[model samples]
Target chain A: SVVSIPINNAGFEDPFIEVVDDYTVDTPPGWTTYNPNNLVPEKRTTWTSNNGVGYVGPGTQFYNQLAPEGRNIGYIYLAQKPGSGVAGFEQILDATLEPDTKYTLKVDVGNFGGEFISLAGFPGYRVELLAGDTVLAADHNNLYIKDGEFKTSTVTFTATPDNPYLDQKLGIRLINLLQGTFSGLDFDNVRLTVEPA
Target chain B: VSIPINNAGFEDPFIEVVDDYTVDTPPGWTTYNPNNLVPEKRTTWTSNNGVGYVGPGTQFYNQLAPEGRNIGYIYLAQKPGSGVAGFEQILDATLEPDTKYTLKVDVGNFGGEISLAGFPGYRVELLAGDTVLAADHNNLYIKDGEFKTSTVTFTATPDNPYLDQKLGIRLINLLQGTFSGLDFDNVRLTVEPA
Candidate 1:
């Protein structure tokens, strides 16, 4: 039998509010934002459904994009105009996984490349599946994208005796690890599917 | 069929404090504190193996757990008359119709009162969606600072529409007072033939 697991605000669709300006950052419901420094307000990164702000200029036509599924998407700030902290978001799934079950996770990742440049090469980000601190599976990609450009990242893993997360509630984390740049990343259509192996 | 749960003993990676009053909750467990108050005053629900201090020299209970290195706790010591604090976990398996199951958990009253009289009572329930299939709200009472086991048995009913959906178990604090301690540890749920 096939079952489609329910994820709260899977496409960042609910609690919707449009952006009047680029600087407005509101915490999306059912998700938590984090920073290691604890020096700045957590709402520095905001949510946008159709297009993102502050990519080229604040509230300008630069970095304009569309959501892959719904009208809402998460716009995570890496080093925008107002902040210079590595910001990310995480959600703990209310559903648990069984032993030896195979699971697949898919998400639409966007790289709004404008003035945001990486010291290494291209800006990079990661999507992780966790059971607490343990990373069961993950996918990492570079921001080799332009306005309205989104790429898909998918990874699969099986629950095992050695996998510390076996039989535990799963957690999803999206991190904007591109350091030393004033850029942003957009995410939507986050999904997870599981079945017996 | 029996399914083993991770962090059943609440011992995986050690506990780490994210801020002054907030220590990260154990893996696979989530906290519910509805009062939107400050971190300390809010029912943030902490995990301890019995070695931590809160506020002005208030010591948490240091009891030997029924199982692992840590037990989950909530400090319902708020100024308001009524405060709610609890923990809930989504089970890995959906309940089978006509199947009997036993839910077991170790409960304790830490007697860590700041300025309150009497101990707080606890409520345990088996839930499918918003509906309650089986519940025991009065059996576990912690008058002293010790641990005791509470168990509830119920058969899955077809009326429980979410039986085909995910099943959850919740432990809530029924008593509301200043600094009333309610702790839980070693939670287990097993299915049996009806």
Candidate 2:
């Protein structure tokens, strides 16, 4: 099996991850928002700022705030409204991309629940890259966290930039879709790399 | 200027505050509901779970359903046609005639506005023998906090046999009054110079 190119090698500018919208997304500064009608309620973005030009909507509700004994655990459950109108947590990234270019995306993912409720939904992270508004490489399924606590891992894939892949805008997203209601996943230290001519 | 001979204190095993209700009203302590005229549904009298007393394991409505409103303070009473519950604390107790007495009660409304003209309001009355010796209204209204103590002033009605018979302090919620339901802390009455 061919090992994918490491994320650090592919080059992109200002590799720090900031919350670009309500759901975390990556845009190269001047890049406009790329969204599809099915992902969101048309024209509405999920980004918010304490002070900014335009703010996004409030993030999803995780806990119902009706805990019986009051838990001391630290984790925020984020909800997402999907294409079928089901509420779940997963940042959907709709990006345009070029073909035949080797691009690498890096995201650190970790889960909160461990040990006791491991079987129900152990914490894990996912990443996907899109070319020309199409899903090119998706790591949505497969990745699973074996330990009880949040653990960080990196995934790398090489793009086979094709007709829809080359010269078109590219999109990438990182998401933590942990099973169960209370537990959540956190992402940090993200970087994107593209092949140099 | 000195301790009086008749002013002796004894422990009554029957009357006690174990919980909101089921008080250790000593066995055969003659407990009966008081029939005080009040605005219909303005006074609540009951010992329902999650209604009157709130604390750990006391079973209370912490959050309102569908709309997600928090119920910090609540009183348990059956609702009337007005679609709102009633208020007031009236009790029947043994009294001693012609004796000076002091009445103190604690009332509360939390995290909201409390007006004396809607659901919960204020009034305190003392009945001696068969006549009302004193009636007081703090006319005091407040909101957004815990229980606060209010004092009512009254002296034994002169020559009233009920003053020496059975005495009770009634917390009145007048008609067209509103009380931001929060919590009630303490209510007490002590006998003094008449």
Candidate 3:
């Protein structure tokens, strides 16, 4: 029989954030953001949860962007400008992956669908299935999502016995690899399933 | 624990001569050439054992099975700007939501005189009606000169209500430029209890 791994707050449904003073400043519950360059504070440099913010004239305003699956989705800013750096979201699964088992990770990834100023070309998104810092499998592609549209990206990886962190804890990360400008990405309905092979 | 899919190795119907040309398209297979209307520019496909350079006779660099003689070949760039041309098969069996299945296919990219940079890409998808259950668009690169196995595992869901009716496998040559050389073989789908 196959097992369905549990991912806490898989849909970014918990620790809801309400629009306050133009924007909500927070990451989804059960997830952490990493900013190594210290370009911005942890709360300001990392991802935030909200319906969405739309573009108005030269600037942007707060508005609800449709979530691909649920009421809310996690948003990240890919700052490609001169002072830009890297930011990402990481979550430790509720269950540890079994050794030598094949697993599939699926996520709904989308473009910001709103206007923004940036000098960097769309470099796309990258997803990693990890046992701690050891990457089991990873995939990256420049997905083309039309305005207000979302597409699903699926990747398969095996939890090999060679993993130093086997049976410890499984971790997943979605990173904004684009730098030197400003852009956005939306994520929701992340799922990881163990194949019965 | 698994059943062998018929013609999975693409070794059936050895070879057939059509219009004085040796063409081999396996039985129970379908091909779509959007430029077929233009006879002068019609794209051709065939099944052969690595012989006859034109049409379906282009040889394969690697055969999954030592005894297998033929593989499915698609003349991807028969028409430079023609939309898309490829093959597909509708399975006789239905996919169950509770069961897990893996779909595997061997693909190869044979770069030709055409500029390699103009090659778009290759895409394989498993679909139930209009819904794509699982897709592997990133595994196969356009310049990779060897045969590689690409696999995707998916289970039917309520979002794909047509899985109860039938499941289909589609192979499309996404390359828009004038570069030819795309071959497929050893298409297999196996189901196991989840």
DockQ comparisons of all candidates to the true complex = 0.01, 0.00, 0.02
Candidate 3 deviant stretches above 4 angstroms: A1-72, A75-197, B1-6, B15-24, B33-67, B78-81, B111-120, B142-144, B158-160
lDDT for position B154 in model 3: 65
Put down candidate 2 lDDT per residue, B1-194, tens digits, no spaces: 12121101112222232223322222211212243222333324541112233333323222221111111123323332122222233334444534445665555443322222223333455554433444443323333344456554444333223333555444443222233233333445676655
Clashing pairs in 1: A79-A182, B77-B179
Chain A TM-scores, candidates in order? 0.74, 0.44, 0.74
Q: What's the TM-score of every candidate structure? A: 0.42, 0.28, 0.46
Candidate 1 deviation (Cα RMSD): 20.4
Question: How accurate locally is residue B69 in candidate 3, as Cα lDDT from 0 to 100?
Answer: 52
Candidate number 3, chain A TM-score = 0.74
TM-score for chain A, prediction 2: 0.44
B84-173 per-residue lDDT for model 3 (tens digits): 555667777776755677778877655433343223334566665544455565343323345667776765433224447667776656
Worst 10 residues of 3 chain A by lDDT: A49-58
Is candidate 1 or 3 superior in DockQ? 3
Residue-wise lDDT of candidate 1 within A64-139, one digit each (tens)? 5555775556766544432233456678898886665677778887655444233121234567766555555555
Candidate 3's displacement at residue B46, Å, is 12
lDDT of 1 at A156: 61
Interface C-alpha RMSD, model 1? 24.2
TM-score of 2: 0.28
Worst 10 residues of 2 chain A by lDDT: A48-57
